[model samples]
Target: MNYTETVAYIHSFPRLAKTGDHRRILTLLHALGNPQQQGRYIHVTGTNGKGSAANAIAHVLEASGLTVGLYTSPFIMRFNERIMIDHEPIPDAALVNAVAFVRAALERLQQQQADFNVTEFEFITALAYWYFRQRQVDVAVIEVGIGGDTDSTNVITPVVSVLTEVALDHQKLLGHTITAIAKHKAGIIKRGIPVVTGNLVPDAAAVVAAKVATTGSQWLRFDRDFSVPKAKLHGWGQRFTYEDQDGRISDLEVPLVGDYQQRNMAIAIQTAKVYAKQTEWPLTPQNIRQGLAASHWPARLEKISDTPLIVIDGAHNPDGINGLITALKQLFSQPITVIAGILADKDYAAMADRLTAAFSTVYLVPVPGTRLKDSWQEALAASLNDVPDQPIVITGSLYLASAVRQTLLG
Candidate 1:
């Protein structure tokens, strides 16, 4: 299959059909020779900051002279962005070949079982594992697509398990309460594996602690085990110090914007440290500094334009929007115009209220593929014409960010 055809074929599968089980993915992987078992892994799961933390960890591993594979979800720009090696998206030809390989395996499984099924996420997860193994990566950082235990990426026994930050998102699928959601997130903890976590609320932290005890996994909590003591915005980026039990790495710089990134970077550094120790790989503070400085995860307070001062952030849920608001307040003194396109399933009213309260003008726009029905082109043109001197922010959904980014940058 060609690149476009491969992508379409993968998307033809159902979105969220199977849940609460991993048997189908396990069977599919077994049929394909279990490529996931060939390499070491760091499995990361959380409601937010998973991509940033995973990217940072992958960068650190790469800086330590390892061929690292990174697997993330909900790509902001392109489908190939979901699976990367050493920070580069999978090439078109390679993606095509990987999909074809996974498709063949799926066909074989179906022929044998007569009722086998695979979702789009599961297929993509299998393809990522196969591609990473085929490329002979030293290690892979796999981000959970949703709640960790039943997520397709949970098949691997990772050297380090990371829960970046748990919040109130995805309550419908995971659970309604914090404890229930925390249980699902903490499900990624494997027996005797070291677990690293961002600063979680007491309820979430307690759940994670109980899971760690049951699994015999060593727990490393933010603020207790590792933390960012001081961080200050510096020229569109931030400079901070990472502190852990071992020592402190001062004057570390990350190009990613926002205040929440400090926590994500700290989690990444600690995860990298634990991963290196587990695998007996040599890691140094210099590697962490260099790796973090080079890490790039887009769509989180990403500045797309400087002249008109346009920025885009993927703040879909209430928690995410709250974080975005805090970051915006810290970064900008004056109110800015906002273009928002949120999903129907999300708490759209709450998100809209927050956006309206924080920004100067709020334009409700329609994301291309979702239930959001309003168009944004006219609003964008108007914003450009009327307020050329004022900064504009495009936010509310990752899909909106992807569409606007493609239109503006591509």
Candidate 2:
């Protein structure tokens, strides 16, 4: 029951379709003694910004002098990136033990039930609970593995729930319309729990508002309850004013590089404010300033070098593209050359259009991800029309930005 064993066992679960209820997860968590209860949680979901939002929240919690855990997905470097505490990844020995622990649980489920199974996401989620509890973390910032309501991470009754801007993604599983998607994400809003939100479309906001009304939960929406004022971005960096509804504001900054992050930070700062004020041990505005300045997350407009100023992001959707485009204008050097690899599931219509205009020349590649499997060349050819010679690609991850950056720099 070591890290290797833990990873090997859980990685064996199938991760195909991301539909259906999270019943299997509940069973597994129950067997593991419900480790989620060992700590406070801030659960987040949406089409985009989940990772950054989670990072922001973690920062605030950590600055408040509490040990925090962060569980996210699609590791830029390693599987362990999905789970971390106090900005440190789970120890290798702990990971091995967690994997083995889960293997034993799976064996029990199979032997006792004669028919028990779970998705890769469910297995990893179980692992997250194990790691967080074993670490005795004070809080865990949890990111939804998929659609919020039925997501494996949704099982946690978080004090705070967050939904970033909802746009078309995983439509096959999440439904076609924004309303349908919002319904799924809104599922994380626990009874009387406070929910934080990033930018949202009118339709999605209305749907979430209804959900808040039903639960009697408080909803914090940007533009209504708070906003980022005078947000300014530099290469791979951003600083903004996090102003609440009352115009009481705090200066927050993030190490994650993106213009979109200003809005995300606004939501995170406001959420952290609620958490701090609500808790017995409240943090001062200085705490917010220090926490935000130290926060860092990757793959959202990340720059690993400066020579050519290459940046990488997981903006595989139209809304993501719009955000990336804005970031590009703000951060990229002259003669921008974007090496993009997006999946087939994305709305290439806008993704392509946004990329074409931002990059002086685009290097397209099919992203090697379980989701968004679009052929980069074909997508570019179809969408970029007259710009067929724009050097498309076949394989790359969000981490490719690092290699591309070095190559461009060297």
Candidate 3:
């Protein structure tokens, strides 16, 4: 199958399985020779900042001159962005080949179970593992699709397990409380493996600590073990200093803009250091400094245009929106113009309240399938006309951000 056909075929599967268990994925991987067990991995899970932290860690490893494979979800621009090596999206031919291989494995698995099935995410996770192994990646950074314990990518025991900021998200699937959510994220923690965490709330931190004790895994918490003591906005980039018990790296910079990125970079730096120690790799401060500076993850407070100063961020949840607002306040003083398209399933009311209060002009536009004003193009044009001098922010749903980014870039 070609690239387009392969993507369509992958999407034809269900988004979630009826029976929530890892049997299907485990069986499928076993049939494929368990490629996930062949490579070193750094597993990342969180309600937010997972992609940024994962990307940063991948870049850092790449800087050390090792082949790095990064697996993320919900690609902003193209499907191939989900599986990348050395900061480049998988080539079209590579994706086609990988999908064909996985398809063959699926056929063999079905012959054994007869009623077995796999979701889109589960299928993609397996494919990524196989592709990374085929490419002989030195290390792969795997981001969890949802809650940790039951996520398809949880099968492998990573060298380092990273849990970013834990907040109330996927409530219906994970749980309602912070402790419940933290427990689910902590599921990636394996016995004797070191776990690195971002600045989690007190309740969530306690929950993670308890899990670490049970698993006998070493725990490194942000603000407790490692931290970014000084960070400042530096010409649309961030310059910060990171320090842990071992050493400190000063004047580190990352092109990924956002105040929260400082913490994310710190997490990445610490995770890389831990991975280096575990693998006995010679990782130098110079490698980290260069990697953080070169790392790039799109659609997270990204400045897409210069003339009108247009920025796009995929801050779908309430906590994410709060972080976006904080970043915008610190960067720009003038009242900003916002073009928002949010899904009904999200806490749109909370997001709407915060957006309206923070920005001067708020335009509620329709996200393709969502129920809203359908003429989003015209609405965006009107917003641009009314506030030609002010900067424009396109945000809300990641789906909305993807559409707008394609429309503008194309």
Runs off by more than 4 Å, candidate 1: 343-346, 371-373
Rank candidates, TM-score, best first: 3, 1, 2
Q: How does candidate 2 score on lDDT?
A: 0.73
What is the per-residue lDDT of model 1 for residues 226-269, given as tens digits with 9 covering 90 to 100?
A: 99999999888999999999989999999988889999999999
**Model 2, 208-244: lDDT tens per residue?**
8899999999888888888876876643576677777
lDDT of each: 0.87, 0.73, 0.87
Candidate 2, which segments miss by more than 4 Å at Cα?
1-6, 16-19, 245-247, 369-410
Q: Rank the candidates by lDDT, best first.
A: 3, 1, 2
- The window of 10 residues in a row where model 1 has the poorest summed lDDT is 370-379
Q: Supply the TM-score for candidate 1.
A: 0.95
